[PDB]
Amino acid sequence: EPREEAGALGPAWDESQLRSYSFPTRPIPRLSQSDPRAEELIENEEPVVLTDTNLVYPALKWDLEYLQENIGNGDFSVYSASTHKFLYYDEKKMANFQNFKPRSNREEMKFHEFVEKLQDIQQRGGEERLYLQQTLNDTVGRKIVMDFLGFNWNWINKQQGKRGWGQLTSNLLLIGMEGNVTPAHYDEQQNFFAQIKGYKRCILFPPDQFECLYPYPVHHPCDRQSQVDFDNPDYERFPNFQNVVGYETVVGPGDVLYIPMYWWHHIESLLNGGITITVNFWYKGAPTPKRIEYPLKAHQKVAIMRNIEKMLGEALGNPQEVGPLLNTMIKGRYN
Amino acid sequence: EPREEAGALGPAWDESQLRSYSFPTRPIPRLSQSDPRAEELIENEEPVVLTDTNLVYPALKWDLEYLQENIGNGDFSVYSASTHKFLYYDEKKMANFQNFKPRSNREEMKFHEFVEKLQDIQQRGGEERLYLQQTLNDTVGRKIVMDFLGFNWNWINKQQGKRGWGQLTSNLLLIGMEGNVTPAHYDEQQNFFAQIKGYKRCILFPPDQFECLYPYPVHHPCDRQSQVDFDNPDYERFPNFQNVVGYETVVGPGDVLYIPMYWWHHIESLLNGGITITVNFWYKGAPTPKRIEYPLKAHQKVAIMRNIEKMLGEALGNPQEVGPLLNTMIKGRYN
Ligand SMILES: [O][C]C1=C([N+2](=O)=O)[C]=C(C2=NOC(C3=[C]N=C(C(=O)[N][C]C([O])=O)C([O])=[C]3)=[C]2)[C]=[C]1
Ligand SMILES: [O][C]C1=C([N+2](=O)=O)[C]=C(C2=NOC(C3=[C]N=C(C(=O)[N][C]C([O])=O)C([O])=[C]3)=[C]2)[C]=[C]1
Ligand SMILES: [Mn+2]
Ligand SMILES: [Mn+2]
Numbered sequence: 001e002p003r004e005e006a007g008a009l010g011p012a013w014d015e016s017q018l019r020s021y022s023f024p025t026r027p028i029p030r031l032s033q034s035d036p037r038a039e040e041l042i043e044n045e046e047p048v049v050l051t052d053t054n055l056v057y058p059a060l061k062w063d064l065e066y067l068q069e070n071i072g073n074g075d076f077s078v079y080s081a082s083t084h085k086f087l088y089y090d091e092k093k094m095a096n097f098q099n100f101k102p103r104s105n106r107e108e109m110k111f112h113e114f115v116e117k118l119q120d121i122q123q124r125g126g127e128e129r130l131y132l133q134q135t136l137n138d139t140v141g142r143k144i145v146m147d148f149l150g151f152n153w154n155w156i157n158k159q160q161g162k163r164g165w166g167q168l169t170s171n172l173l174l175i176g177m178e179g180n181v182t183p184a185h186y187d188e189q190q191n192f193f194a195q196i197k198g199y200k201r202c203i204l205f206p207p208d209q210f211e212c213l214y215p216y217p218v219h220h221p222c223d224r225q226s227q228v229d230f231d232n233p234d235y236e237r238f239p240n241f242q243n244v245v246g247y248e249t250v251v252g253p254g255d256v257l258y259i260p261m262y263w264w265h266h267i268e269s270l271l272n273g274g275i276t277i278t279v280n281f282w283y284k285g286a287p288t289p290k291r292i293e294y295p296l297k298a299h300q301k302v303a304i305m306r307n308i309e310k311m312l313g314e315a316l317g318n319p320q321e322v323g324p325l326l327n328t329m330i331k332g333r334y335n
Numbered sequence: 336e337p338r339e340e341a342g343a344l345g346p347a348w349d350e351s352q353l354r355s356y357s358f359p360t361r362p363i364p365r366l367s368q369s370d371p372r373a374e375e376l377i378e379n380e381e382p383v384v385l386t387d388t389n390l391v392y393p394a395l396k397w398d399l400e401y402l403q404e405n406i407g408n409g410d411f412s413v414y415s416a417s418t419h420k421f422l423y424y425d426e427k428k429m430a431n432f433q434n435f436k437p438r439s440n441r442e443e444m445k446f447h448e449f450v451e452k453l454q455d456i457q458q459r460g461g462e463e464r465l466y467l468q469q470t471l472n473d474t475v476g477r478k479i480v481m482d483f484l485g486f487n488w489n490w491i492n493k494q495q496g497k498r499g500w501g502q503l504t505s506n507l508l509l510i511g512m513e514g515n516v517t518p519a520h521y522d523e524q525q526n527f528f529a530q531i532k533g534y535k536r537c538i539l540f541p542p543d544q545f546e547c548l549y550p551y552p553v554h555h556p557c558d559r560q561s562q563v564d565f566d567n568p569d570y571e572r573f574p575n576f577q578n579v580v581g582y583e584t585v586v587g588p589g590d591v592l593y594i595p596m597y598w599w600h601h602i603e604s605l606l607n608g609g610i611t612i613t614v615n616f617w618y619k620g621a622p623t624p625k626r627i628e629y630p631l632k633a634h635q636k637v638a639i640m641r642n643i644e645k646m647l648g649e650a651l652g653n654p655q656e657v658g659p660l661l662n663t664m665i666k667g668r669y670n
Binding site for chain 2: 210215216227239292305315323326327330332333335
């Protein structure tokens with residue numbers, strides 16, 4: 001249901017820019033930040049697209065040319081992938097899984113090198129894909145600092161206070177190539193996803209879909225990522241992926257998506273849609289109330305499972321024995 | 336390989352008194368307490384039958400007539416079972432499993448009532464089976480106190496000190512009917528099993544046979560007992576019971592069996608062999624050394640599994656959700 005750009009500029013996107021998947025989806029509500037329904041969704045830990053926060057308004061003019069001049073000469077972390085899927089891996093956990101071979105590489109370089117490398121790929125017509133991820137701090141140039149200070153800190157700080165969240169833990173500038181895919185994963189923090197340039201399709205799954213999405217072992221370098229290849233799902237290894245249902249939206253410049261903590265998200269930059277720019281705001285979650293409500297939420301059950309996997313790895317002295325012990329505990333007893 | 340009683344009194348037992356099972360066994364060593372091999376077995380947490388401890392020497396004269404006179408008028412806990420299998424259940428845990436129906440009953444009665452009830456069953460030729468289990472304390476009569484004080488406390492106290500064990504946690508007098516079976520289970524304490532009257536076949540399994548013996552969930556009333564019916568094993572529910580190998584011995588009057596903590600034991604009173612009397616000594620285990628050796632023993636892995644089941648039940652607020660969460664953690668991730 002592509003929205004129409006103002007001034008009769010045509011549809012913002014067409015469906016042929018969206019990749020094809022096996023599961024059904026329904027739309028995330030697009031609302032005004034003044035609408036009480038938006039506040040109710042955020043308070044209830046459910047996603048919403050806010051259309052008028054002005055959260056990153058001064059950055060709406062950002063593009064590669066403007067950024068290259070004013071971001072200054074600093075090292076920016078650039079990730080590379082041969083396929084459209086970008087596979088992040090925790091280097092610290094690579095020791096436990098010696099047979100793991102990384103499929104993405106990170107290279108620190110200046111902004112001009114990133115722009116030239118991106119243009120070079122297009123000039124060659126190649127299939128190498130790139131992804132820049134860098135924190136918005138004082139190291140950037142003065143003009144970017146002015147834009148950064150111009151974010152709607154009043155709106156987001158009030159959101160932090162009202163929801164009882166913790167501290168702003170990270171702020172990442174995010175520049176990607178058309179067709180790039182960040183595969184399904186979850187984060188342990190609250191996120192506001194502020195779209196700046198281009199369009200990104202965001203597909204979210206509630207925390208109770210844990211059984212349908214098959215995350216890696218906690219000690220694996222791909223911890224918190226789904227094991228299921230969304231392009232070629234292995235229903236024999238992952239039967240419950242046949243039951244997964246998602247919440248889908250396409251975010252464009254000016255939109256902010258609240259991704260609640262522990263919610264799975266799959267994010268792709270629209271095919272043939274140009275480069276994308278996003279700024280992400282992550283906040284530590286609110287502390288658990290000491291008065292535990294025993295129904296118990298899915299995200300709390302996820303936290304329990306993570307803690308058990310972590311404790312078991314420490315107690316056995318080797319995270320690779322977690323699986324055999326768990327199977328010993330369950331087979332013929334709980335299954 | 337039935338031993339011959341002294342004075343040409345014939346074989347102590349014949350094989351037709353031993354029940355038939357599906358698994359193979361090998362013999363537990365029968366040794367003198369002065370033999371260094373016996374000390375090495377106890378120190379290494381392996382079973383041994385000691386033939387000459389004199390641990391319960393003054394009780395070797397005990398029988399039903401002598402006990403009835405001198406034990407005095409007190410209440411003794413008598414357990415009843417319709418079948419030869421005695422199913423102990425933890426009454427405290429019965430709340431968690433409402434669908435559990437107990438198969439044994441406990442009734443407090445005086446010693447004369449126990450003797451008459453036992454004789455009554457034989458007079459009727461009935462199939463009701465009975466089992467008396469009572470602590471050796473000051474409540475018993477003066478003559479039983481003299482016998483109790485006459486146990487080889489010097490030998491057993493030295494064993495407690497040498498092995499670093501904790502305190503004598505329980506001392507149970509154990510009187511049963513011929514054919515009685517205590518099904519396979521494990522205890523979390525060190526045990527000396529002092530046979531007094533009649534013969535008992537003891538079948539022990541090392542702690543690493545956990546996977547072949549399928550204990551109940553920790554929160555189940557039958558916690559620490561094997562789910563496998565040794566008389567009719569369900570190989571579909573319990574495939575690894577086809578791999579179980581045990582250590583077997585027949586203990587008679589004067590023998591003491593060390594049952595190391597966490598070792599599975601199945602104990603039966605020989606068919607057509609008369610009543611049996613045993614006194615059990617349980618000691619708390621030695622504290623774990625702070626210098627953990629990372630190979631890690633099977634009994635330590637059992638303790639870890641028990642702790643995880645207990646913690647999970649508390650965290651979820653309902654022990655019946657332990658199974659579904661464990662399966663959620665494992666399916667498609669560790670299995
Ligand atoms: O505990 C502090 C803390 C820190 N820290 O140390 O400051 C860093 C992180 C963090 N590290 O990485 C990400 C991340 C997550 N998700 C995405 C994503 O989903 N991108 C798709 C798209 O299109 O937006 C991402 O790009 C980065 C977050 C989290 C917590
Ligand atoms: O933590 C203190 C503590 C206490 N406490 O509270 O003092 C009681 C027990 C205890 N409770 O029951 C038994 C028991 C175990 N095993 C057998 C058995 O295997 N019998 C077969 C046979 O033929 O010997 C048994 O008869 C009783 C032991 C354990 C620890
Ligand atoms: Mn994320
Ligand atoms: Mn026992």
